[PDB]
Amino acid sequence: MNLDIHCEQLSDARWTELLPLLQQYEVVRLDDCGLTEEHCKDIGSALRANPSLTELCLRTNELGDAGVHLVLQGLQSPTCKIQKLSLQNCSLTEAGCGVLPSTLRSLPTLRELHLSDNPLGDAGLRLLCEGLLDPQCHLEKLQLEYCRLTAASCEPLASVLRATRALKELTVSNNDIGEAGARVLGQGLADSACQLETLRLENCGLTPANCKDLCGIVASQASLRELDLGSNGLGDAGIAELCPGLLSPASRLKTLWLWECDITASGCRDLCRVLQAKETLKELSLAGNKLGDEGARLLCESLLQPGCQLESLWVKSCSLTAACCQHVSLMLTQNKHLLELQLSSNKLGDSGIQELCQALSQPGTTLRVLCLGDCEVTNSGCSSLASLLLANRSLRELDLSNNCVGDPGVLQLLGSLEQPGCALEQLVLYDTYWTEEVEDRLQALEGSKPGLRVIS
């Protein structure tokens, strides 16, 4: 039914046993096997005679320029009614991209295509776009991350866009296209008939200047649910320039990713008017940004305006310290909509943890997830977490990996977990050291209540 060798260096016998099944399997995911051009030969042949296959994934395999050419030719048969094809990290250069046009012509069934981590260069994207145009090609989700695509690749894509109305997902992250290219692209997107749902542009080199152009798309694309803009120095100005469109009554952006974008206190102020305004914004990352305790104070105020219905908030590594916990905690007790909280890699220390524990231990709390990963918590801090675990009913997950916790810390956690009324489900402690004695009590508590996982 579904082939799925993954991370297994396939024996020549298993490949041969497999072969005739390739003509029968609906789904095949030969990810990271000993695959090469040799295997590709058989894959190709077997590809042309399989009438039911709907997804082929030849991921992380040195298929190469030759081996991909043949695999492709397998899909080039009328019989082939594939809908999803991935060739992530398949060592495909702008050379093997020669067959993409002939190929996208024949597959008006293909709907999803992943070419990421392949050195297509602009030369590869170019040939890729000659197929994307044909009125016999109707792709919906295109992913071209880590492709060595400079800005040259933007006009031909802008071109593919002004002609399409199919595409629902575009991800070009990790390609140095810069301010100019993204404008050529932002422009094209504007004059396009499609309704996107997901748009991703990480470490692409945008500048505040590009936000101005985005402002339109966002404000108008009603089908846009996720907007992932991380790792782009937009800074406070870009953010500011970005809100007018987010307030747009036709924007229902559910997920906004803005990590490592150069935002400080100033920019949150601009963002908070949104949380207060938008009952549609649900998830939101701000990790990396140096918001500081004041950036913190700020966000809290809008998580109290009951009209704010944000569920998942991430502030991993946002220059916070103990001084924000007094606010963080107050919010936590009164807020009836927030469920997840990433506070990891923030120097909260033992003292910060405690206010949280007290706040959270109050009646009616709702936070289901609290990741205090890497926040400088010690054995003495698990003692607050301990009392917390007893009194709080809402928490389903508590991440605490990467802290200064040891035996006495865990033991105090276990005291509470081993009890009867504990509601927790996962206690995440990756990278934490403890000895046999404890590990036994662990494999032991992990015996009494088996529906509680303690991960490491």
């Binding site: 991370c7 880590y146 990480e202 790792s231 990713w257 990891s344 010690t378 050291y433 000895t435 590990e439």
Partner: protein
């Protein structure tokens, strides 16, 4: 099963590459070592020396670990390592890592006799 010595062999050893090939190394390893199975492991380091050249750190310099326990022996030789570190765009199930290669001293914990290593502590 999985003895804590095995968890270590699985979670932090790569005697084959002497250094990380690309910037796309971690994303695979974390996967082929089940570190991104239930959730994404926040950070993990791989050592590129032979196993015996690593099991020998247990009878070397004795140092106190980050949590104050005393059984952490730090090695003298700057060993070839690799720091895998989740990226901002790592929303599990979708896990992502930034690969950084580097040569550093590696402190690890040892337990029992055979005094084998059972947890990677830090580099310096």
């Amino acid at each position: 099963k999985e003895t804590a010595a095995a968890k270590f062999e699985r979670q932090h050893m790569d005697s084959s590459t002497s250094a990380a090939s690309s910037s796309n190394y971690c994303n695979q390893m974390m996967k082929s070592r089940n570190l991104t199975k239930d959730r994404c492991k926040p950070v993990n380091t791989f050592v590129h020396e032979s196993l015996a050249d690593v099991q020998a750190v247990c009878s070397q310099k004795n140092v106190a670990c980050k949590n104050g326990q005393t059984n952490c022996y730090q090695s003298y030789s700057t060993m070839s390592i690799t720091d895998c570190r989740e990226t901002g765009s790592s929303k599990y199930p979708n896990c992502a890592y930034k690969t950084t290669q580097a040569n550093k001293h590696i402190i690890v914990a040892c337990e029992g006799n055979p005094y084998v290593p059972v947890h990677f502590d830090a580099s310096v």
